[PDB]
Design a protein around this ligand. Structure first.
Ligand SMILES: O=C(O)CNC(=O)C(=O)O
Length: 371
């Protein structure tokens, strides 16, 4: 039987959690023992975990926990922490894609004889990820897209969409979006048309769900996926839509989805592009109309068009953080079957694959300290 210890997040403003009070309750029902660190920045109240049966402990207590506990967290630890990592850790560590400082991250595990099971690389036997955040990335992206479009109906071009902040629950977000939307319609604006590229995936499903909940008619949504995009861009449907939401990550040389030439047109209706797949490291952006990665404090950036109405991009790479509760609940539910295999981790392929991947990347690290 396994003991899990939920590490309080230390990444600034990280409000999500790898285990929710609901998943904790379910794991305890399956015979797990669960510690949960008190965390002020978590969107979950510590008392939810207490009612779920967790043992409540101070933030950072994982550092002195018995070596047999599996330390689970969502995001990175402070790069300023240097002490050896002696536990088995489950987390996103962001150190398998040659990220700055990746060798140092792994060296902490190496020195401590610890283990990293990286959440980004946990996959089923078919090679599909067991847990990610696509649905709420799309849902939050669509929400902000509608808000920006509504803002443009109700404000002058010299004003930009103000700072946004995480919401406590989905209902609260839908209410805000719907209020903005209804105020836009009051002006004489028509219900927006929305083009979604990647409509069939989790991101697309999430975007569609938000739109429906806000009251955007299904007839106003153009649902594109590979069938359509494989024709090759640029696509006229992009400037003709009121709002364009991209869910497909593309990083190879290919004809762009749109470009400044196609956007520089007085007949363009497009007001808002939400690139849910925004990645500042992407060498080949298929929507090459922005270079800034926007953020909650400054969520939109101007596309510098020479004709047509004001156009902005939302290029936030952490959209799920707009709805940290639901994002966590979905992620943790998706992860739960794998977590149930932890007693069997020495043999269960989902965990063995992740261990061997860790081993392989550690072997890439050559250091005099290891001699
Ligand atoms: O889900 C992924 O592939 C990577 N996710 C994150 O870095 C995150 O959600 O904070």
């Amino acid at each position: 039987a396994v003991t899990l210890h939920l590490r309080a997040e230390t990444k600034p403003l990280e409000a999500r959690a790898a285990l929710t009070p609901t998943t904790v309750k379910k794991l305890i029902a399956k015979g797990f023992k669960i510690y949960v660190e008190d965390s002020p920045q978590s969107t979950f109240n510590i008392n939810e975990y207490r009612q779920a049966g967790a043992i409540i402990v101070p933030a950072g207590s994982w550092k002195t926990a018995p070596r047999d506990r599996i330390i689970i967290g969502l995001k990175e630890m402070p790069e300023t922490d240097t002490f050896p990592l002696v536990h088995e850790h489950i987390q996103f560590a962001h150190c398998y894609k040659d990220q700055a400082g990746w060798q140092n991250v792994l060296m902490r595990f190496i020195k401590g004889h610890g283990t990293l099971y990286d959440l980004e690389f946990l996959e089923n036997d078919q090679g599909r990820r067991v847990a990610a955040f696509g649905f709420y990335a799309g849902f939050a992206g669509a929400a902000l897209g509608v808000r920006d479009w509504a803002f443009k109906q109700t404000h002058s071009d010299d004003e930009d969409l103000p700072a946004v902040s995480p919401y406590p629950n989905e209902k609260a977000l839908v209410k805000d979006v719907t209020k903005d939307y209804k105020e836009a319609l009051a002006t004489g604006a028509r219900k927006p048309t929305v083009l979604i590229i990647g409509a069939l995936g989790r991101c697309g499903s999430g975007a569609i769900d938000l739109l429906h909940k806000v009251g955007i008619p299904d007839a106003n949504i153009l649902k594109w996926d590979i069938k359509e995009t494989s024709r090759g861009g640029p696509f006229d449907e992009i400037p003709q839509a009121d709002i364009f939401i991209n869910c497909i990550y593309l990083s190879k040389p290919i004809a762009p989805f749109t470009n400044m030439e196609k956007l520089n047109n007085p007949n363009r209706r497009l007001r808002t592009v939400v690139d849910v797949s925004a990645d500042t490291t992407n060498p080949h952006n298929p929507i090459p109309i922005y270079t800034v990665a926007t953020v909650f404090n400054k969520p939109t950036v101007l596309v510098p068009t020479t004709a047509g109405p004001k156009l902005s991009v939302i290029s936030i790479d952490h959209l799920p953080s707009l709805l940290p509760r639901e994002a966590s609940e979905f992620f943790s539910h998706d992860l739960l079957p794998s977590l149930e295999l932890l007693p069997q981790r020495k043999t269960a392929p989902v965990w063995v694959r992740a261990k061997k991947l860790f081993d392989r990347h550690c072997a890439r690290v050559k250091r005099s300290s290891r001699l």
